[PDB]
Amino acid sequence: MAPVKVFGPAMSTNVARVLVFLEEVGADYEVVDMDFKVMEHKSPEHLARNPFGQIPAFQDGDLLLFESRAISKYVLRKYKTGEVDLLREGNLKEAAMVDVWTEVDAHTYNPALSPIVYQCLFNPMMRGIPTDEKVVAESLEKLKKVLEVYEARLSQHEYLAGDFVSFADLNHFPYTFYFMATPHAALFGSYPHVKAWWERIMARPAIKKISATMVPPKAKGH
Ligand SMILES: N[C@@H](CCC(=O)N[C@@H](CSCc1ccc([N+](=O)[O-])cc1)C(=O)NCC(=O)O)C(=O)O
Ligand code: NA
Ligand code: NA
Ligand code: NA
After folding, report:
1. CA–CA separation, 2 vs 61, rounded Å?
2. Residues 100 and 208 occupy one common structural domain
3. Which residues contact 52 (CB under 8 A, 6 or more apart)?
4. Same domain, 108 and 179
5. Ligand 4 ion local residues (Cβ < 5 A)
6. Which of this chain's residues are annotated to bind glutathione (predicted)?
7. Residue 145 burial (10 A CB sphere; 0-12, 13-18, 19+)
8. In angstroms, what is the span from residue 200 Cα to ligand 4's centroid?
9. How many angstroms separate the CA atoms of 131 and 58, rounded?
10. Which of 108, 142, 149, 174 has the highest CB neighbour count under 10 A?
């Protein structure tokens, strides 16, 4: 039957996103590393997997996929356990709530948090480009407003879609993980329900496993 293949280094946020869901359902998989220093993601071979020249790409037999959230939902459906139901697709209103807060991550939370990761981590280390502190300052003020909403939401439920962990919650892991390595990692402590939610996510065996393969400078970067 052959395990599925993920193309891209495990440290890349959107690769890690897929690996988390693979681990949640206990599926075998192969991580195919790629050399960004020779721009392997822009090679003719990889463009045939992801025509926009990005990672992850994904292969299951003759099926090629890209876009991390699409890959992840395919994994969750293919390996649907019964022991794990992260999409709630058998329940219309639960699936809707999972969908809402998955979209919130994609279009409200991650656009506020991701720039801080880029400016404080990716740009200086990976690209040799210094931190633009005005982008950081503007993004932090937006993130704080987002976190005020999350704090209220997570005061009523343990997770974002209700009293169950879901696709919505776990999609928050890869970029927030790296945020915890920036100078702004203490931010969450001002939002106690958000911090507790985050710690529940970090306690998950699948999350523990993948975060160990991403390895920051050292865990919660000081
Ligand atoms: N929507 C897509 C986004 C995928 C994506 O952005 N992949 C990035 C790597 S993860 C995000 C990321 C970007 C940059 C760094 N960095 O260190 O400079 C780290 C992580 C990529 O391949 N970029 C190459 C390109 O677009 O040309 C998905 O979720 O799959
Ligand atoms: Na990019
Ligand atoms: Na599911
Ligand atoms: Na918004």
Report:
1. 8
2. yes
3. 66
4. yes
5. 108
6. 14, 42, 54-55, 68
7. exposed
8. 25
9. 32
10. 174
